[PDB]
Structure 1
Amino acid sequence: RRESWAQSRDEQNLLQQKRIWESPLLLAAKDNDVQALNKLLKYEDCKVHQRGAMGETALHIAALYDNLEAAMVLMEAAPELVFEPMTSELYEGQTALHIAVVNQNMNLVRALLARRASVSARATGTAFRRSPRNLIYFGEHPLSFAACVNSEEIVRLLIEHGADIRAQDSLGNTVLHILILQPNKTFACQMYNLLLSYDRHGDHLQPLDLVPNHQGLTPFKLAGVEGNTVMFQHLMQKRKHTQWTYGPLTSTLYDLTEIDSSGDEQSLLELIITTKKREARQILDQTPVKELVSLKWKRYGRPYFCMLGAIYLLYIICFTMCCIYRPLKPRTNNRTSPRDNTLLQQKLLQEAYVTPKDDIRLVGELVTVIGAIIILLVEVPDIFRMGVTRFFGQTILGGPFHVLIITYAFMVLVTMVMRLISASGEVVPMSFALVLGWCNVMYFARGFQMLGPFTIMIQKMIFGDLMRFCWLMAVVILGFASAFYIIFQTEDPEELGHFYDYPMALFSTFELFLTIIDGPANYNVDLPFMYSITYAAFAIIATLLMLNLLIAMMGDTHWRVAHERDELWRAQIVATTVMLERKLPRCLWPRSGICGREYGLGDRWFLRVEDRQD
């Protein structure tokens, strides 16, 4: 697992410093050395196309290593170096105007545009694409370089020389898309005003803040996915509208034309719940969003989710009582496989659908089999199209309730098949189907505020505080159950039969680890001497040490992530409201907001709110 990309850059970054030292003009270009430049440029053995490691020339070195006096000599002598991009794979197409802008100013940006630089170039090299492999994502264009380093004097200077205000990039990110996802959120706001102000064209055509990138996201909705909260409240200053101000009581109208899911497009409430960044979910507590989440949920989100929880609750009772009242006949075979080790006295029947009690039960299987098909035709065609167990298998990655309800309906049909062709033991699909089928009532405990943030803590305590504990449980019990087995092996099994064979020894020792049996103690016969020593050490790495450490570890974590488990619950209301918005039919479901036609604002929906500010 060697990072060969890390070596391949480091083998080249040292190679560039080599090529400058073994070259007379490049070393003179690293420093100023204007006495050394004028000597070499006179003799006609210059080789001004001396091409370095990262495809650089004497003009790229004079601009990267800042030397204004060297670059004046190079442009005056050979002015054809201005029209020269680099050719190496990391820095493709990066001109001399690109480098002199990232050094935040020069007089060279006056001087390069004097001798006809390219204001519209393409820095399409692999060290400029956004990745966890490049420290910067400045874009590709020179006005995208100057806007990200917060240089107003250069941004005003490139439009005057013919910058393109709306030039997209390889990912389709325009200049307004890039400023949002820069790490300095405050100074991005100051450039965001200056960039939009210099458009003012009648050639709008989804003008400058309504132009999407290649994945479809607008500038406003890109702040939704990424998580730039400081950019988000600045974007809402153009959507809102003040209505009246009566004392300390103002009323505004927000514009729900890019937040609310109409019926077809992927809106901002949908894009937050699909992404996985933790900085993306402070947008659920902003001033147009925390009402629209609540007003869908109080009005038409909670009662539809309690009726959909009460149908599933009466569904699983009709699955329980067809497992309580199974067709089950007495045993036909003679026992004869030692009664010293046998208890079985019933057998499965083949055709018991004759009594009127079974005809009432035959309704009960027909309810729970049809219900198992309706599950597999509303959720399994989701993982068909969206992603092969990974993209909509983010629920196979987090929030595991999708996997359980499939596994329930997968094993009602195995219970159907083993009934039809009359196979061997039917208890095996049923025993999963009950414990799977009832533990999805815990899905319907996210609407109730009492039970909401507690179902979070059964998830975050089973994927990292009980899961890391069981790797050092199976280390311990494999040590002791193999130790307790070989002690009680040259010994009588009918009395103290905790360890008579090795699969049982793994299950007696697992029970002593948790104190869910008593302990092997059989006074009136004498146990061997080595047992009381090795059980005393298994009385300590045990109940005493590694069961009270798990109380402290679950007790430590339960107040560390307590701010998070609340705001992880409020994102399980948005995850459910929008889910019922697209799976239920449109007919019940009024659209959230006040239309702007009958009063006259347009066709856009709206939502008003009142507040005191004193």
Structure 2
Amino acid sequence: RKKRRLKKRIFAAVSEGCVEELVELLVELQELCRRRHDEDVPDFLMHKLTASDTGKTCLMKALLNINPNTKEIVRILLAFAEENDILGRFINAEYTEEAYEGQTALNIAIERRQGDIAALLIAAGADVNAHAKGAFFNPKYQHEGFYFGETPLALAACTNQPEIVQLLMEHEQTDITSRDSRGNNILHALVTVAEDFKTQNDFVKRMYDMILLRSGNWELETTRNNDGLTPLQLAAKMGKAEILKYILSREIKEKRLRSLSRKFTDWAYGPVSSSLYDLTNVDTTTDNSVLEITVYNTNIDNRHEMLTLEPLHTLLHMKWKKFAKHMFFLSFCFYFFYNITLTLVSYYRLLGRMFVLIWAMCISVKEGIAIFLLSDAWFHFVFFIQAVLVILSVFLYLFAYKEYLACLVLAMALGWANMLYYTRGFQSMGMYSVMIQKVILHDVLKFLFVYIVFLLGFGVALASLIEKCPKDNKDCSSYGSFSDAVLELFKLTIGLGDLNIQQNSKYPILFLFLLITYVILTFVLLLNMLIALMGETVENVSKESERIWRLQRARTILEFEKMLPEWLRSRFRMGELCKVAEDDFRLCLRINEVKWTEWKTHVSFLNEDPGPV
């Protein structure tokens, strides 16, 4: 009765914080009641001081309930806990809840914009590596929770509290490399947060930089999460760009940390400057490079801004200029002669048949493997269907059947629809084929479906009126068969038909009116297809088509690179070994750049003599 009301009034006065003298007299009464217990006194003191239901303490109930007079309350509580020697057992306490598990006063204050209180708590012996592991802090769907790597340092860095970040880095008790329940250190977490500049104003990047300056080591970026990814690979797997543009391009002025950078200028006689990047985890040599992660995944829908970056773009361009152009031309020639021999055969109905039978197996196996790996992959399924139909046609050819030719001819048609694929190589033809695909996916299906609807709706009526028997004269009662009427409508929409009022009909007037309405509706539907095309034609088409072109070209380049053997890959390795700093030899990519605007005495350079060799 009195004790429960006492505890309730304690927490209520904390939530209100109307007067610290109230709390002083109240904690004095608590200390006076403490004398009643002789043994196990501090545990009971905590229990009367702690909400055992949720595992919550009065200090947390205070920090949650912010008021201007909170600092004095916290000082009083901490001085009391020190006078009774429960400071450590009091600060480090956390919740017992399933979602709030691990939350502490420090993470509360940092979830708030208050840092001084956090400093006071840390001076009192507060834990800094507090891992808050809970459904709240480890949610799904980004709703009803908030993920930040589950550390106070990560919480402060994500929330733009750099002073507290410096504090938490200053203490030796800090564990920068501390991995969370998910395995993500603070870098991974920052990478999980950097939505976009328009949303954040690019503070996460500054914190990334500051943290890497605070720890001059490659330890963090070398780490891997439970998924098995470096934070670079993590940003790539996600839709993060500005952070990646920062990472892949770093020029540091500090000669001591000069090793941590990945971009370098080796000489600059003036406006000229031969910048020098790195390729450690970027080239395809790694298990899952940044390039693969960017190119293969369609889960992002941001890969254009990703690939437009300097090193990736230059790597793609060089790999196409070296071998992929020739490989594409070569596959094109193979398919060219393949389909030409196929035509020669199908027209006149041994060497060409053998060549076709030999070359079909490679395509078949490659298509099967691609499907096992798998609207970008439509072409693979189409080639697979083509090869399947061809092998079926030949198998039928061996047998004494007659349907074989049908399959064969179908393949031919499909085959000549597949050469469009190779047109995608050329930039003009690239945007050409991509416009084909986008239009056939977006606008044409609507037209076709609703036009089939109208075909049925009007052809049923046309056949109904044509139900008037011609006395066994198919020429008299045109539109007699339903399919016949639909075929006549098709000829009409193309204009081949020979329309005429049919005496074999009960009503020529209604027939003509309905036909005219059908023609009008078909014209208007075609016209609306054209309008819906023109509506997006100008702005989205060009950009989307060029983005898709570059993306699919990179995909093809990586595919062909994966097709090659180890030794040829070793031969075509782009980049060059270079001495960076302190007996460090790493791979690099060279880009000669020119700048007439930014003038500066070039202080930092690898090579004194600007000579290319």
Query: What code does the residue aligned with 1:65 have?
Result: N
Matching of residue 126 in structure 1 with residue 114 in structure 2: no
- 1:64–1:99 Cα contact (<8 Å) kept: yes
Range with greater deviation from structure 2 (447-456 or 579-588): 579-588
Which residue of structure 2 lines up, in the alignment, with residue 555 of structure 1?
A: 534
Which residue of structure 1 lines up, in the alignment, with residue 592 of structure 2?
A: 610
TM-score of the pair, normalised by structure 1? 0.79
Pick one of 148, 151, 156 that aligns with 1:138: 148
Change (3 A) 1:165 1:571: same
Percent identity between matched residues is 29
Change (3 A) 1:569 1:381: closer
CA displacement at 1:109 relative to structure 2: 1.1
Query: What code does the residue aligned with 2:211 have?
Result: L
Query: What code does the residue aligned with 2:224 have?
Result: P
**Alpha-carbon distance between aligned partners in 2 of 1:91 and 1:436, rounded to the nearest angstrom:** 60
Change (3 A) 1:365 1:122: same
Which residue of structure 1 lines up, in the alignment, with residue 224 of structure 2?
A: 212
Pick one of 275, 294, 311 that aligns with 2:297: 275
**Alpha-carbon distance between aligned partners in 2 of 1:166 and 1:583, rounded to the nearest angstrom:** 38
- 1:272–1:281 Cα contact (<8 Å) kept: no
**Alpha-carbon distance between aligned partners in 1 of 2:414 and 2:405, rounded to the nearest angstrom:** 14
Which residue of structure 1 lines up, in the alignment, with residue 92 of structure 2?
A: 83
Which residue of structure 1 lines up, in the alignment, with residue 177 of structure 2?
A: 166
Query: What code does the residue aligned with 1:292 have?
Result: L
Matching of residue 300 in structure 1 with residue 289 in structure 2: no
Which residue of structure 1 lines up, in the alignment, with residue 475 of structure 2?
A: 495
- 2:447–2:526 Cα contact (<8 Å) kept: no
CA displacement at 1:455 relative to structure 2: 0.8
Q: Larger relative contact order (C-alpha < 8 A, sep ≥ 6)?
A: 2
Range with greater deviation from structure 2 (428-437 or 590-599): 590-599
**Alpha-carbon distance between aligned partners in 2 of 1:373 and 1:129, rounded to the nearest angstrom:** 49
CA deviation vs aligned residue, 1:173-217 (integer Å, no higher than 9, x gap): 2112222332336211221122122224xxx5x522322333333
> 1:94 is paired with a residue of what secondary structure?
coil
Change (3 A) 1:29 1:432: farther
Which residue of structure 2 lines up, in the alignment, with residue 335 of structure 1?
A: none
> 1:596 is paired with a residue of what secondary structure?
strand
Query: What code does the residue aligned with 1:593 have?
Result: M
Range with greater deviation from structure 2 (554-563 or 107-116): 107-116
> 2:156 is paired with a residue of what secondary structure?
helix
- 1:227–1:281 Cα contact (<8 Å) kept: no
Which residue of structure 2 lines up, in the alignment, with residue 32 of structure 1?
A: 17
Pick one of 364, 369, 380 that aligns with 2:357: 369
**Alpha-carbon distance between aligned partners in 1 of 2:107 and 2:577, rounded to the nearest angstrom:** 47
CA displacement at 1:380 relative to structure 2: 1.4
Change (3 A) 1:85 1:510: farther
- Pairs within 5 Å for 1:471-510: 471-492=449-470, 494-495=474-475, 499-509=479-489
Which residue of structure 1 lines up, in the alignment, with residue 3 of structure 2?
A: none
Pick one of 98, 101, 112 that aligns with 2:110: 101
Pick one of 161, 175, 186 that aligns with 2:202: 186
Pick one of 381, 386, 391 that aligns with 1:408: 386
Change (3 A) 1:436 1:123: farther
> 1:611 is paired with a residue of what secondary structure?
strand
Which residue of structure 1 lines up, in the alignment, with residue 446 of structure 2?
A: 468
Change (3 A) 1:500 1:321: farther
- 2:386–2:414 Cα contact (<8 Å) kept: yes
- Pairs within 5 Å for 1:552-591: 552-561=531-540, 562-588=542-568, 590-591=571-572
Q: Count the aligned residue pairs.
A: 541
> 1:251 is paired with a residue of what secondary structure?
strand
CA displacement at 1:108 relative to structure 2: 2.7
Change (3 A) 1:27 1:536: farther
TM-score of the pair, normalised by structure 2? 0.79
Change (3 A) 1:519 1:142: farther
CA deviation vs aligned residue, 1:14-73 (integer Å, no higher than 9, x gap): xxxxxxxx9655544433244765676646798444356x76444433223324255556
- 1:243–1:251 Cα contact (<8 Å) kept: yes
CA deviation vs aligned residue, 1:220-259 (integer Å, no higher than 9, x gap): 3433333433223322111122122223222122222222
Change (3 A) 1:106 1:541: same
**Alpha-carbon distance between aligned partners in 2 of 1:559 and 1:499, rounded to the nearest angstrom:** 43
Change (3 A) 1:156 1:267: same
Which residue of structure 1 lines up, in the alignment, with residue 413 of structure 2?
A: 435
> 1:122 is paired with a residue of what secondary structure?
coil
> 1:250 is paired with a residue of what secondary structure?
strand
- 2:476–2:504 Cα contact (<8 Å) kept: no
**Alpha-carbon distance between aligned partners in 2 of 1:231 and 1:249, rounded to the nearest angstrom:** 27
Change (3 A) 1:467 1:64: farther
Range with greater deviation from structure 2 (62-71 or 517-526): 517-526
Range with greater deviation from structure 2 (590-599 or 166-175): 590-599
Pick one of 302, 308, 313 that aligns with 1:285: 308
**Alpha-carbon distance between aligned partners in 1 of 2:508 and 2:318, rounded to the nearest angstrom:** 71
**Alpha-carbon distance between aligned partners in 2 of 1:595 and 1:446, rounded to the nearest angstrom:** 32
**Alpha-carbon distance between aligned partners in 2 of 1:421 and 1:73, rounded to the nearest angstrom:** 97
CA deviation vs aligned residue, 1:438-473 (integer Å, no higher than 9, x gap): 222111122212201111111111222222333433
Which residue of structure 1 lines up, in the alignment, with residue 601 of structure 2?
A: none
CA displacement at 1:310 relative to structure 2: 0.8
Query: What code does the residue aligned with 2:291 have?
Result: L
**Alpha-carbon distance between aligned partners in 2 of 1:447 and 1:145, rounded to the nearest angstrom:** 47
CA displacement at 1:479 relative to structure 2: 2.1
- 1:225–1:280 Cα contact (<8 Å) kept: no
Change (3 A) 1:500 1:39: farther
In structure 2, the gaps of 5 or more residues are 1-6, 34-44, 251-260, 597-613
**Alpha-carbon distance between aligned partners in 2 of 1:380 and 1:496, rounded to the nearest angstrom:** 54
Range with greater deviation from structure 2 (559-568 or 468-477): 468-477
CA displacement at 1:138 relative to structure 2: 1.6
CA displacement at 1:553 relative to structure 2: 1.2
Query: What code does the residue aligned with 1:451 have?
Result: M
